[PDB]
Design a protein around this ligand. Structure first.
Ligand SMILES: O=C1CN(C(=O)C2CCCC2)CCN1
Lengths: 300, 237
């Protein structure tokens, strides 16, 4: 297990860790989060009590360094930082643990939710989407735009998701205009999988990362990317069986975790109805179709 | 974006534009089979591509062989249309290529957009105008060349004959759409109006009769009467 200590909590804030949320009061004796499962990426996230504007947070992996959180009263936000003095860090964490000033990452015997939401997500790939090479962790917030949104503005603060555009020369082979538009297999398998992502694991990782940025920060361009990556698969007539089976599992856990109350703004009615009922893969996503029909039948 | 009554004079400005109408590309007769099932037989069709400013009609004849062994022909027909318009554009000198292409049916937008990706500066637009270009096959000389084609062929016409010597393109388009609307509403009567006077003929190099200005005013009123007549017969008014 690993630990993300907090220097202090000077402003009242709702703190997220992965799929959990908890409240810290202004100047409450809070010094961090312990028992964080090694082996996964994690996200620690924030929504200030006095200005819900800007959810923000940090993607990190405890295997890569010793990280802590410290409020900056000038920039007005909780910042992640790396402590290079490993003995200083271990000494700090131990004191805070001895004084029980840390909330424990829950350990649940019957739940594998976070694994199932981050199975293909790697810190190395997050750091290529979120470019800030001098840190081992990655800052994301509500307002950050994607490279694709920026083509239709600060390049340093952008989400560099892979651009997917169905009416683009990359998507459509000269002389196969009808074929490629109505059956996106070429774009999926040759352009994206073989060409850009190299394998389906990297494709799923970006899809999963996009969903989590949509859900945890309300990041609109992230929701657009997540739906585009689903639609590209569902709109391809030729998809390897293992990718369809895995996609069904990925989406099932994503729909399962979605706050019931946010489905109106996180789910695109057109994409979902197309994917489940009209697309080539309309009969290949049994688990996802079942949870969608029982959880959000209005959307359909 | 879309073209409608608010931006109608744009049709006659000096930016090159084309209307594309696909309603006569895929044409069939429905009939009974010996077993008493139903089957279609395709007949030759045409793409109706029109410069409203100049009258230049690019009539791409769609021969029935293009459907042989193909499935989902009504969908294929939109893509074949976009394929042929894109080929036409590429065949034109740069300074003749359109700045906008207006499709008369919104189902032509994505096919044409996809085929024109190489031309990002050509706007592909719908329209809220209900244009009567389906009636193009009621013009005898166009119907003749389509039905006689034995192979794919492009034929060029001026659908305005020599009217632009005497009237503006706005007025010429107004006449053309009134004639086509009438041919669409009651073809027999419209042709009777157009051809009831043997002394007014259609020149070999023309599509419509050689009416004087005063005779066009008469013809144009008879066409409006017919459209109003049929409107009464239709709704019992
Ligand atoms: O992060 C935490 C942990 N908590 C839990 O474990 C509650 C929430 C769902 C599981 C029971 C709430 C306190 N904060």
């Amino acid at each position: 297990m690993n630990t993300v200590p907090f220097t202090s909590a000077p402003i009242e804030v709702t703190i997220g860790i992965d799929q959990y949320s908890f409240n810290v009061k202004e100047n409450q004796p809070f010094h961090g989060i312990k028992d964080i499962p090694i082996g996964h990426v994690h996200v620690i996230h924030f929504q200030h009590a006095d200005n819900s504007s800007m959810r923000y947070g940090y993607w990190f992996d405890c295997r890569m360094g010793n990280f802590y959180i410290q409020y900056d009263p000038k920039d007005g936000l909780y910042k992640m930082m790396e402590e290079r003095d490993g003995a200083k860090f271990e000494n700090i964490v131990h004191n805070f643990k001895e004084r029980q000033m840390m909330v424990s990452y829950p350990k649940i015997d019957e739940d594998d939710t976070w694994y199932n939401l981050t199975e293909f997500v790697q810190m190395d790939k997050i750091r290529k989407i979120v470019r800030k090479d001098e840190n081992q962790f990655s800052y994301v917030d509500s307002s950050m735009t994607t490279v694709q949104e920026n083509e239709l503005s600060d390049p340093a603060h952008s989400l560099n998701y892979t651009v997917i555009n169905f009416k683009s020369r990359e998507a459509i082979r000269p002389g196969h205009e009808m074929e490629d538009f109505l059956d996106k297999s070429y774009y999926l398998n040759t352009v994206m999988l073989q060409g850009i992502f190299k394998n389906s694991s990297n494709y799923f990782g970006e899809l999963q990362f996009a969903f989590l940025n949509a859900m945890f920060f309300g990041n609109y361009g992230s929701s657009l990317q997540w739906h585009a990556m689903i639609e590209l698969i569902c709109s391809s007539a030729t998809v390897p069986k293992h990718m369809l089976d895995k996609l069904d599992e990925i989406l099932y856990y994503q729909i399962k975790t979605l706050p019931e109350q946010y489905s109106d703004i996180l789910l695109n009615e057109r994409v979902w109805n197309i994917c489940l009922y009209s697309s080539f893969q309309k009969n290949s996503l049994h688990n996802t179709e079942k949870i969608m029909e029982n959880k959000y039948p209005e959307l359909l | 974006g879309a073209m409608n009554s608010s931006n109608y004079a744009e049709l006659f400005n000096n930016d090159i534009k084309l209307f594309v109408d696909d309603t006569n590309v895929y044409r069939v007769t429905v009939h009974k089979t010996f077993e008493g099932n139903v089957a279609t037989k395709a007949i030759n069709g045409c793409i109706f591509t029109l410069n409203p400013k100049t009258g230049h009609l690019f009539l791409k004849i769609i021969h029935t062989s293009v459907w042989a062994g193909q499935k989902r022909l009504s969908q294929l027909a939109k893509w074949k249309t976009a394929e042929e318009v894109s080929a036409l554009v590429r065949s034109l000198p740069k300074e003749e290529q359109p700045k906008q292409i207006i499709v008369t049916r919104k189902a032509m937008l994505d096919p044409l957009e996809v085929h024109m990706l190489d031309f990002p500066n050509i706007a592909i637009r719908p329209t809220e105008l209900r244009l009567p270009f389906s009636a193009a096959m009621s013009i005898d000389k166009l119907s003749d060349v389509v039905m006689k084609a034995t192979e794919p062929q492009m034929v060029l016409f001026n659908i305005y004959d020599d009217w632009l010597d005497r009237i503006s393109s706005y007025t010429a388009f107004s006449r053309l759409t009134l004639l086509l609307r009438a041919l669409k509403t009651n073809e027999e009567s419209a042709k009777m109006i157009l051809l009831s006077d043997p002394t007014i003929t259609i020149k070999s190099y023309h599509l419509w009769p050689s009416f004087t200005d005063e005779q066009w005013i008469t013809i144009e009123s008879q066409m409006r009467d017919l459209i109003l007549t049929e409107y009464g017969r239709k709704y019992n008014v």
